[PDB]
Amino acid sequence: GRLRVVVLGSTGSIGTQALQVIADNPDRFEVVGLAAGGAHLDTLLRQRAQTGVTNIAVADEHAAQRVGDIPYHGSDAATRLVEQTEADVVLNALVGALGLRPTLAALKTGARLALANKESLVAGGSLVLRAARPGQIVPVNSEHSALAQCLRGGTPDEVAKLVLTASGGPFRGWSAADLEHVTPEQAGAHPTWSMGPMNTLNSASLVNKGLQVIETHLLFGIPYDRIDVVVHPQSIIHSMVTFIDGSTIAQASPPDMKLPISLALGWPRRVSGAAAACDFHTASSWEFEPLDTDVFPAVELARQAGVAGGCMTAVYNAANEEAAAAFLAGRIGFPAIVGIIADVLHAADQWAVEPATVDDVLDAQRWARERAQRAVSGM
Amino acid sequence: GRLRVVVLGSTGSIGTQALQVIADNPDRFEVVGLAAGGAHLDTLLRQRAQTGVTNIAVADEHAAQRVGDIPYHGSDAATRLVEQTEADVVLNALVGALGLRPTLAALKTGARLALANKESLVAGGSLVLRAARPGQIVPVNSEHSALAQCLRGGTPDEVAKLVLTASGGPFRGWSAADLEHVTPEQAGAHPTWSMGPMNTLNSASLVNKGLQVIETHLLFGIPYDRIDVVVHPQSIIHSMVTFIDGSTIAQASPPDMKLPISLALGWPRRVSGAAAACDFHTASSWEFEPLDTDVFPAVELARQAGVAGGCMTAVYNAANEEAAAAFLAGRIGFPAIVGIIADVLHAADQWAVEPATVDDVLDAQRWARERAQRAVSGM
């Protein structure tokens, strides 16, 4: 039958790709709602015009002054749309803190939650897990998608290891000496139309993989000591699962986010023709190498934060966002990003308590930001 | 809860490794029967002593005399042992045409058939298939075991292509001209799997992969034009399945037959500690390259034999048995192995009829052997 989809974060990379998948498959999906932040209001209104979907939300009341016929506008417009719209799937592709409440509201409706928003698990942690029922959250990220597919190779009891693949970023194989010279431009700072300035940087620092390890733990309930990372520069294998008998199951495809997006939307049913398959008519090789954790300790720190628990992973992420933004502005050097994450984490044990409310989480991030700010300025 | 296992071909590489798995896992398995040819009486005696199994079959009447109080002796011994032993699983690891009747005996008993004997599927075809219930035949070979695991990645209607991996053999990359003067010593050089001159030769000629394509079609019901072969020299990826969305699911382990054997014996349940897993704290590469179908047409011949159906795959296999023995005996050259197969198949008009009985299969094989001999006499 046809799945009713609410698209939250409709004007971003994931949201617009999802809308293409939906447009290509009207047999499988219909859009029933759209939510955006306000900065790309003209895109959202063009989406209303094209899809015929009048059920739209704009978070920015000031931006909403421009339109006059938005049913939901202002702070928590996306949450109210989720609360009041009948749907089968909520795609949460909102960015940052504003994704958290809509995740919670979506879980409450009982819909499937196709999750792209990182803050929901990384910051929200136990608030989100306590609210979610088994299998309700389907991840959109290609690594987590790969894991969800490979886990079909046995029972939960048969799992020995989850193995996440990492590109290695631009500085794969570089020494600690090399990393001292890293400029913002080298670490992927360009005014790219597509993605956030932090996405390329987090991949270079290995914080992205740290964040993915944390999400892997919460999604699949596997201990941090059984979650491994391997470097794989080709990015064809998106992740693997090792089972108790010694067998490893891996998922492979040429990079294309429409594959994991389509599957997240249609879960558990695959969507015919979503992506190109691996072609074996031409020679290739898939390479693996250990991550140098002495030079790139960002994953080890993510495990330390995750094992600590509570609001510690929110601290890790908020410390990163401040330090990484500081590097991009020329206030610190590249090695200091993860250096500062560590120093803030090591002073953050008051935050190991479990959050009771969204505000608890917001309080931890606030503390982490200003702690990171002090470490940057030397104050 | 404990599965009773008959091991046919116990003294071979597969049989010995199977008994090791059974010994390591006494709460999952027990041996209740053994059958051997009579070439390795030293091993059989030890197996009797270690397992305490006196319920044994020996093919050679001489060898059965030496061993002492063997309840089944002669060429029908293995078949009679199966017919009369209460068991849950029958492991058929017999070599060549000897495996067929025990295979049919085993299926008529209702036991799971853990199948290593290629002949009984390749030659037996629909005669074997009609005797089996859905999922009664569970494959022992690395490639088919990988496929079975990978097929868990989706529903049957979601399967686009099965991809079998080939090592390429010692002559991977070689010229047709280069093949002209290959000797039996070069063809038996560095065995990837733990088996003798015959199985090593079939890896080198690509006939083994052709037989495995036939088995794949019969085991999984996938059309020949949807079964692909890729060359992968490392032999870590054992096979793959491509799904209709563009996702490929692959299985990987360091070469070790104990893994597929243990999963064949315990299907659907994985056996803890069966084999060592891929170690992703060490660098490695998985290489892929296309097969040179011009220099190696054996797989295409197997497809053509398979498409014709009936007793034609029995013709393909018997023609190989005969040309291969002639190569090993110094009578013909290497390129003549597959040249004779092509010649026999071209003359095999009448063998496209489906076998009603074992004797139909035997008729075809008998004819193929004679026709292969006439092809050898002409060189």
Side-chain angles (χ1 to χ4, degrees):
Chain A
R2 205 151 67 117
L3 290 170
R4 290 164 300 179
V5 190
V6 170
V7 183
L8 308 176
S10 77
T11 68
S13 184
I14 302 293
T16 54
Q17 287 178 104
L19 283 174
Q20 287 184 326
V21 167
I22 293 161
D24 291 351
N25 296 279
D27 46 308
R28 295 280 308 265
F29 312 109
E30 64 159 331
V31 195
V32 295
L34 298 166
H40 297 102
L41 174 78
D42 297 346
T43 300
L44 178 66
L45 298 184
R46 282 189 166 100
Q47 288 171 334
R48 172 165 73 181
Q50 291 160 0
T51 61
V53 176
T54 57
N55 189 38
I56 66 159
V58 181
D60 201 287
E61 257 274 4
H62 197 257
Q65 301 310 111
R66 303 188 177 276
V67 191
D69 60 356
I70 318 275
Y72 311 92
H73 48 86
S75 205
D76 282 292
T79 297
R80 283 181 275 126
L81 187 151
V82 169
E83 282 166 346
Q84 286 170 54
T85 309
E86 277 195 56
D88 302 304
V89 189
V90 183
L91 175 71
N92 189 357
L94 295 157
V95 40
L98 47 98
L100 181 63
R101 288 193 185 274
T103 283
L104 289 176
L107 298 168
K108 201 197 191 205
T109 63
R112 210 117 222 197
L113 172 67
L115 193 54
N117 181 254
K118 276 218 180 311
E119 259 226 23
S120 296
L121 284 168
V122 169
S126 67
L127 269 172
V128 169
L129 275 194
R130 297 189 332 256
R133 290 187 259 127
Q136 189 172 13
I137 302 169
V138 178
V140 170
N141 175 89
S142 71
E143 288 85 353
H144 297 132
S145 182
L147 290 171
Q149 298 182 66
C150 300
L151 283 162
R152 290 167 165 189
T155 66
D157 293 355
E158 288 172 342
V159 181
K161 270 172 183 255
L162 306 190
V163 189
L164 282 71
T165 50
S167 71
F171 318 128
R172 172 192 144 251
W174 286 36
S175 64
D178 295 326
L179 290 189
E180 297 291 322
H181 317 300
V182 167
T183 72
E185 176 168 65
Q186 286 186 301
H190 312 101
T192 304
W193 99 287
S194 251
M195 65 209 78
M198 298 289 293
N199 287 145
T200 314
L201 178 50
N202 286 354
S203 152
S205 67
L206 272 105
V207 169
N208 186 54
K209 207 58 44 172
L211 294 175
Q212 292 183 170
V213 165
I214 294 160
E215 293 176 296
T216 298
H217 173 79
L218 298 157
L219 284 166
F220 306 110
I222 302 288
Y224 286 105
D225 65 17
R226 299 203 264 119
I227 306 173
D228 287 11
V229 172
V230 68
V231 169
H232 170 60
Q234 291 74 37
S235 298
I236 309 301
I237 286 156
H238 307 290
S239 275
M240 309 178 273
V241 178
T242 303
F243 295 89
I244 55 167
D245 58 0
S247 184
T248 298
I249 304 291
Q251 190 272 323
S253 57
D256 184 341
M257 279 303 301
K258 287 197 178 169
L259 182 50
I261 291 167
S262 73
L263 193 47
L265 293 176
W267 196 269
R269 262 186 92 195
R270 304 177 172 284
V271 176
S272 184
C278 286
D279 175 30
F280 298 105
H281 291 109
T282 161
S284 80
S285 75
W286 303 339
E287 299 172 350
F288 301 96
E289 70 190 56
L291 177 69
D292 190 349
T293 65
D294 292 314
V295 179
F296 301 97
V299 182
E300 304 293 307
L301 278 164
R303 297 196 185 94
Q304 290 170 25
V307 169
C311 298
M312 295 296 291
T313 63
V315 170
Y316 173 88
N317 185 56
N320 176 71
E321 225 130 61
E322 187 63 44
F327 163 74
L328 286 181
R331 287 181 262 126
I332 63 160
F334 187 75
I337 301 167
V338 178
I340 285 164
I341 292 169
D343 293 338
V344 172
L345 253 201
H346 297 345
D349 278 345
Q350 65 192 275
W351 297 110
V353 184
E354 294 290 3
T357 66
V358 170
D359 277 348
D360 285 338
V361 175
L362 292 169
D363 288 1
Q365 302 177 309
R366 198 166 301 121
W367 181 98
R369 285 201 310 278
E370 100 74 52
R371 192 85 188 195
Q373 283 167 4
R374 293 260 173 180
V376 167
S377 65
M379 298 197 58
Chain B
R2 213 211 300 193
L3 304 167
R4 294 162 305 188
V5 187
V6 170
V7 181
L8 311 172
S10 63
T11 57
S13 182
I14 300 295
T16 48
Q17 290 178 104
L19 295 179
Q20 278 168 39
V21 172
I22 294 163
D24 287 346
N25 294 276
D27 285 356
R28 288 278 298 273
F29 313 109
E30 75 163 316
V31 194
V32 297
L34 300 169
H40 305 104
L41 301 174
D42 45 299
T43 310
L44 185 65
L45 294 171
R46 178 168 65 256
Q47 296 181 348
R48 177 158 70 186
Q50 290 176 332
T51 64
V53 172
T54 47
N55 189 35
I56 296 168
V58 178
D60 184 31
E61 290 277 356
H62 200 133
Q65 113 74 27
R66 301 175 178 189
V67 178
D69 90 302
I70 291 298
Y72 306 102
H73 44 102
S75 59
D76 64 330
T79 301
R80 293 190 281 115
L81 171 87
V82 169
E83 288 167 341
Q84 290 174 38
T85 311
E86 260 187 56
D88 302 294
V89 180
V90 174
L91 178 80
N92 193 347
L94 293 164
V95 181
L98 309 173
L100 178 61
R101 285 180 177 276
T103 280
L104 292 160
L107 297 174
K108 284 165 174 72
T109 65
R112 165 181 309 132
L113 178 67
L115 193 49
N117 188 246
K118 296 194 289 302
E119 260 253 350
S120 60
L121 257 191
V122 178
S126 52
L127 181 78
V128 165
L129 287 181
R130 286 194 305 269
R133 60 156 183 278
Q136 198 180 353
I137 303 167
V138 178
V140 170
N141 297 20
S142 278
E143 290 84 353
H144 307 120
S145 181
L147 285 167
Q149 298 176 67
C150 292
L151 287 168
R152 297 169 158 189
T155 63
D157 63 291
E158 293 180 341
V159 178
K161 269 167 180 294
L162 312 185
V163 182
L164 275 88
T165 51
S167 70
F171 320 120
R172 176 183 65 98
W174 285 36
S175 178
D178 290 348
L179 293 190
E180 274 165 21
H181 302 279
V182 165
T183 66
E185 294 73 47
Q186 306 188 258
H190 324 279
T192 322
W193 310 112
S194 179
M195 275 137 232
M198 194 50 190
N199 276 323
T200 302
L201 173 61
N202 291 352
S203 292
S205 66
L206 265 293
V207 169
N208 183 55
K209 211 47 55 174
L211 299 171
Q212 283 187 160
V213 168
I214 298 168
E215 285 175 289
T216 305
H217 170 75
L218 301 167
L219 283 165
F220 300 111
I222 298 292
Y224 284 99
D225 66 351
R226 294 208 273 122
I227 309 159
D228 286 345
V229 172
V230 74
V231 168
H232 168 62
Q234 288 79 35
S235 289
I236 292 153
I237 293 202
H238 302 291
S239 277
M240 310 180 268
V241 176
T242 296
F243 295 91
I244 58 177
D245 57 352
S247 192
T248 296
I249 300 303
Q251 189 272 338
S253 44
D256 183 349
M257 283 303 294
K258 281 190 170 186
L259 177 62
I261 290 172
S262 70
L263 189 54
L265 293 175
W267 197 271
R269 276 175 60 204
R270 300 185 177 276
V271 175
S272 187
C278 290
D279 185 6
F280 298 110
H281 302 130
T282 69
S284 66
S285 75
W286 300 341
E287 283 178 332
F288 297 95
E289 58 174 84
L291 183 72
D292 197 341
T293 57
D294 292 328
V295 188
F296 304 93
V299 175
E300 310 308 325
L301 287 177
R303 285 193 216 277
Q304 296 163 357
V307 165
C311 298
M312 280 286 209
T313 55
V315 167
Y316 172 91
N317 180 57
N320 183 67
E321 275 168 339
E322 298 303 299
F327 170 74
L328 291 179
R331 171 64 181 88
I332 66 168
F334 193 76
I337 297 161
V338 177
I340 289 160
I341 298 171
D343 189 38
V344 177
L345 284 168
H346 174 82
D349 295 64
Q350 63 172 309
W351 303 112
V353 184
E354 302 276 351
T357 70
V358 175
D359 285 279
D360 294 333
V361 177
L362 300 172
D363 288 355
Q365 292 181 327
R366 192 180 303 117
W367 178 92
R369 289 185 211 284
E370 197 183 39
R371 182 66 183 86
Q373 298 148 21
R374 261 180 305 284
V376 169
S377 287
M379 356 192 109

